[PDB]
């Protein structure tokens with residue numbers, strides 16, 4: 001129409017609490033799930049396809065993000081991990097993000113695999129801002145772990161999220177730091 005419907009993101013959110021409660025037990029990892037800005041509004045269109053994205057994001061964080069208990073106090077922190085999902089008003093843009101206080105992705109290691117395959121050389125590397133070094137997992141086929149047979153019929157390249165985000169004219173950023181955690185943003189229009 002010529003009048004799009006804005007709805008609270010509250011709707012797409014209230015669903016996660018329970019799935020996080022499952023992925024938590026499923027992986028035996030008590031995760032303290034926290035949701036903020038639940039009263040933000042976003043186009044009814046976005047709302048629909050926006051569930052899987054954030055979902056995958058929570059999925060990674062609860063699986064790969066949070067670590068088990070002494071690995072945490074041994075690292076120096078609370079036994080219980082914290083997964084924070086949020087969304088506010090930034091200009092005319094709805095900024096959503098999934099912060100976890102995780103283990104976090106390691107940026108030089110990526111280069112070790114991104115280089116052990118050639119999308120960059122030694123020299124470039126020194127010009128890749130932390131952002132660019134991470135944008136790499138956006139590359140279709142970037143994790144070359146799964147490939148020969150253990151290639152299970154399904155999956156979702158972290159690009160389907162840059163797809164679901166790009167089908168939407170969205171933009172995602174990734175900020176990590178070894179053993180502190182990982183913060184992934186998804187800036188959207190309207």
Ligand SMILES: Nc1ncnc2c1ncn2[C@@H]1O[C@H](COP(=O)(O)OP(=O)(O)OP(=O)(O)O)[C@H]2OC3(O[C@H]21)C([N+](=O)[O-])=CC(=[N+]([O-])O)C=C3[N+](=O)[O-]
Pocket residue numbers: 060061063064065066100102103104105106109110111112113114137142143145182
């Ligand atoms: N929120 C998150 N917290 C932690 N890890 C996350 C997160 N989100 C996505 N990941 C990526 O997911 C991988 C899972 O890490 P870990 O749980 O120790 O091992 P898994 O073999 O069980 O995972 P897999 O089943 O291969 O996805 C890591 O692989 C890598 O970056 C990590 C990784 N790493 O953790 O060091 C290095 C790497 N390269 O290339 O060097 C590529 C990854 N990757 O592609 O996913």
